[PDB]
Amino acid sequence: ATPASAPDTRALVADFVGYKLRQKGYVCGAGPGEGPAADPLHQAMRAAGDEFETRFRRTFSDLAAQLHVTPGSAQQRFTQVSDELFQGGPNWGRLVAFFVFGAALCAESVNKEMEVLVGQVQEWMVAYLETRLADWIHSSGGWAEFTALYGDGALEEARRLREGNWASVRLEHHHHHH
Structure with a gap:
């Protein structure tokens, strides 16, 4: 017994984005309350x-001003930060973090009609995902661990934890003795 799947990973992505866009302008959907769904994707x-x-x-106003001062690049910067720390860290903390970024920077680049760069950020995402994230994913299988996480x-x-290691961007310099 091994069910199949027609949809694609890309479809699910565009879904969260498109929906998040209308969620502010024109909400459209239903009211899931007591409707058990096999795949709790949504x-x-x-x-x-x-x-x-x-x-x-x-996190918005806070992460805004705080991360503001410190000179940071665009979307590409957000990812680089996550992958920087997550570099060999199959922890969930990076899941909720790296995610909040992709989304936030998503609706931003989208609404601002900046789709050009948008498609770029994502492309890189799925790239490293199947590149070095293909292992940590193969273990848990995927969202599986997340659902029960x-x-x-x-x-x-x-x-x-997430804001702990991430926001912990404050470290100590080196000691130059002679």
Whole structure:
């Protein structure tokens, strides 16, 4: 018994984006309350998103000013940061982090009619995914671990961890003695 799949990974992506766009302008959908779904793809995607948004408080205004001062590049910068730390870290913390970025920088580059660069950021994503992320993914299989990851447990833990190592961009210089 091995079910098949017609849709594509790309489709799911454009879905979260397009929906997030109308979510502010013209919401369109249904009201899932007691409708058990085999593949909690949608529910899952929303969970992660709202997870980081609920975990902290004002990541937008906060991460805005804070990350503002420190000279940072565009979208490409956000990813580079995540991959920089996640470099060999199959932790969930980087999931909720790297995600909040792709999305935020997604709707931004999209709404601003900056799709040109948008398609670029994503392309790179799926690239490294099957490149070096093909292992950590093959182990858990994918969202599988995610579905059962945030099943039960304080969220404040996942954030503090993510914003902990990430926001911990503050380190100590070197000591030059003679």
